[PDB]
Design a protein around this ligand. Structure first.
Ligand SMILES: [Zn+2]
Length: 202
C-alpha cells in the first residue's frame, strides 16, 4: 500500500519543500523517467541526472530527511501533471526504479520486449548482473495505466536496481552526497546505458 492514491493527494498532504519535480526537455525520442527519486529509491536521481546529459528526463524526488517512503506513488497511479505531459511528448520511455535486495541485481522488464532483451544482453556482456523478467512476472511494467507506457508508442523498458547494485555506484549513499561521490562503477554503468540508448533508438 502507498500512502497517497495520486499526485493531487500527495501535494495536498506534503510540504512542497519535501519533494521536487525536475524536467529536462530536449526533443529526444527517448525519455528517462525516475518517479521514485531522491530518498524514495536512492540512486535513481543520480542515474537519471547523468543520462539527462544526452536524453530528456522526468524526475520526481523525495527530499525528506526521513520517511520518504510516504512519497512513493506506484507507477500505475503516478499522474503528476508534468509527468503526464513529458511521457505523452516522447516516443519511448526508460523507467528507473530501486528495490530492496543486498545482492547486486538488475531486473529488466517493460512492454518493449525486443529492446529489454537487448539491454539485458548488453549489460551481461559488460559484466553487470541483469536478468530479463517476462510478461507474467509480477510488476512487469506492462499495464496501460503505468506512467512509463503513456508515450506515443507505448514501448517502455523498466530497470529495477537492487539496493546492493545502487550502493555499489557511490562513495557515500546519502541524499546529500551520492551526487558528489559517483565512482568508476557509476560511470562504467551509465556509459553502457549511453551506448545502448544511442544504438537501440536510431
Ligand atoms: Zn520505484
Amino acid at each position: 500500500e502507498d500512502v497517497y492514491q495520486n499526485f493531487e493527494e500527495l501535494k495536498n498532504n506534503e510540504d512542497p519543500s519535501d519533494y521536487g519535480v525536475v524536467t529536462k526537455e530536449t526533443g529526444s525520442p527517448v525519455l528517462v523517467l525516475a518517479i521514485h527519486g531522491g530518498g524514495i529509491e536512492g540512486g535513481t536521481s543520480e542515474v537519471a541526472r547523468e543520462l539527462s546529459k544526452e536524453y530528456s528526463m522526468y524526475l520526481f524526488e523525495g527530499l525528506k530527511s526521513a520517511g520518504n517512503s510516504v512519497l512513493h506513488i506506484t507507477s500505475t497511479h503516478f499522474d503528476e501533471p508534468r509527468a503526464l505531459k513529458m511521457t505523452g511528448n516522447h516516443e519511448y520511455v526508460i523507467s528507473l526504479h530501486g528495490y530492496a535486495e543486498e545482492d547486486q541485481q538488475i531486473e529488466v522488464g517493460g512492454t518493449d520486449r525486443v529492446r529489454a532483451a537487448d539491454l539485458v544482453e548488453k549489460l551481461q556482456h559488460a559484466g553487470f548482473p541483469a536478468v530479463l523478467l517476462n510478461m507474467d512476472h509480477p510488476h512487469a511494467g506492462v499495464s496501460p495505466n503505468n506512467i512509463a507506457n503513456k508515450s506515443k508508442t507505448g514501448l517502455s523498458i523498466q530497470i529495477e536496481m537492487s539496493t546492493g547494485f545502487r550502493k555499489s555506484l557511490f562513495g557515500i549513499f546519502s541524499l546529500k552526497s551520492r551526487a558528489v561521490t559517483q565512482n568508476e562503477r557509476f560511470y562504467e554503468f551509465t556509459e553502457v546505458m549511453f551506448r545502448f540508448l544511442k544504438n537501440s533508438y536510431l
